[PDB]
Amino acid sequence: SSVPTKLEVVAATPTSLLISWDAPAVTVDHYVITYGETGAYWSYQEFTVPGSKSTATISGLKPGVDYTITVYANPYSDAPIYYSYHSPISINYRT
Amino acid sequence: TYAPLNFIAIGIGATLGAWLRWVLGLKLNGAGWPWGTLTANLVGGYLIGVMVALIASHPEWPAWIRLAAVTGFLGGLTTFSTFSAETVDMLCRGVYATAAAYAGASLAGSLAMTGLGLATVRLLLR
Amino acid sequence: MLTYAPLNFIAIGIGATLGAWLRWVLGLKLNGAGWPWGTLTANLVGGYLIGVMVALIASHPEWPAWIRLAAVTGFLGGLTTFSTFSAETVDMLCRGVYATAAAYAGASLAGSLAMTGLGLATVRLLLR
Ligand SMILES: [F-]
Ligand SMILES: [F-]
Ligand code: NA
């Protein structure tokens, strides 16, 4: 039981990805997406999408590289994400 | 001296500094960079260079002025626990470049701000 | 409750107060010229405890929000300190002893992070 769920790549190009997930029926405050070359943590980046959003676009990627995309949900309106009680959902897309 | 008026200057000082740090975190802590706590640390770092240099040239001030503004306000304004929690969380999620950039900005910037806080007082008297 | 509630400022002030009193004594009983043991203990102890508090709150969503404002934003916010550390480190630099300066920044920087990791590990160890 994670939040969000059914994360996937809907549209993909050689240098961009469009990910989608199932926003829970109860809106969260915002999500935090972290992505990067699987293992290469000095390449990991992160951005935040509002709770109303259920899709995000990841651009500026390198071809043929295996990426890990993780989405963290923050239920708090006034606390950072490390206080969250939601297990993130993560996927992996190549290219 | 463990005087009752001493505990009253710490509590009143930390209570104010904490509140200001809290509100800074709420309104400022951005989407990828903790501007709220970094602000409280840099500012607090600059204000201690002024207070320390100021308490040096005014040894006639009472013992509660330093315990209220340095041990009280700045003691509660800046934090290390909230800094390492945030930094450790960045490492947890894998953003090592951000954690490194955040640690550096906090450490170097705090030292330099505390330096500029001393240089301003010494330049002010000369 | 909601954000900015009067009971929140109370939990922050009380926590920050008890946090500064503990930091103040520590900075007088163990703090000595050449090396500030008091300031290092307040930050290291605080760094470990916030790791514990963050792990507890994450696994106990039911707890009221004032446990976080009192224990973390309050207590651990008055216990730890970046200001006094920055001043002590800049004193070491102007006093020439660059070796102990680096030894201090690294000890309290990497020390805090490691202690936070242990705090997180301590909780993760027992709840499971
Ligand atoms: F910081
Ligand atoms: F700490
Ligand atoms: Na503090």
Author numbering:
A (entry chain C): 3 to 97
B (entry chain A): 3 to 128
C (entry chain B): 1 to 128
Which text from the study accompanies this structure?
Moreover, the channel dimer contains two F− permeation pathways, with each subunit contributing residues to both pathways (Last et al., 2016, Last et al., 2017, Stockbridge et al., 2015). The chaperones required to obtain Fluc crystals (engineered "monobodies" derived from a human fibronectin domain and selected from diversified phage-display libraries; Koide et al., 2009, Koide et al., 2012) bind to both ends of the channel protein as in the crystal structures of Figure 1. Our purpose in solving these structures is to gain insight into the hyperselectivity of Fluc channels, which pass F– ions >104-fold more rapidly than the close analog Cl– (Stockbridge et al., 2013).
In meso crystals of the Fluc homolog Bpe in complex with monobody S8 diffracted to 2.8 Å Bragg spacing, and the structure was solved using molecular replacement with the Bpe channel and L2 monobody (Stockbridge et al., 2015) as search models. To our surprise, the asymmetric unit contains the dimeric channel with only a single monobody bound, as shown in Figure 3A. One end of the channel has a monobody bound in a familiar way, with its diversified loop occluding the aqueous vestibule, while the other end is free of monobody. The ∼950 Å2 interface is mainly hydrophobic. The only polar monobody/channel interactions within H-bonding distance are between D80 (S8) and T3 (channel) at the periphery, the carbonyl oxygen of Y43 (S8) and the backbone amide of Y98 (channel) at the opposite periphery, and a salt bridge between E48 (S8) and R95 (channel). Whereas normally crystal contacts are mediated almost exclusively by monobodies, in the Bpe-S8 structure the other end of the channel contacts a symmetry-related channel in a back-to-back arrangement. Despite the asymmetry of the complex, the channel itself retains the same structural symmetry as in the doubly bound channel structures, as shown by aligning one channel subunit (subunit A) of the Bpe-S8 complex with its partner (subunit B) within the same complex (left). Although only one end of the channel binds a monobody, both ends are structurally identical, as well as identical to all published doubly complexed structures. For these reasons, the Bpe-S8 structure, taken together with the electrophysiological results, provides strong support for a cork-in-bottle mechanism of monobody block and its logical accompaniment: that the crystal structures of Fluc channels represent the functional, F–-conducting conformation of the protein.
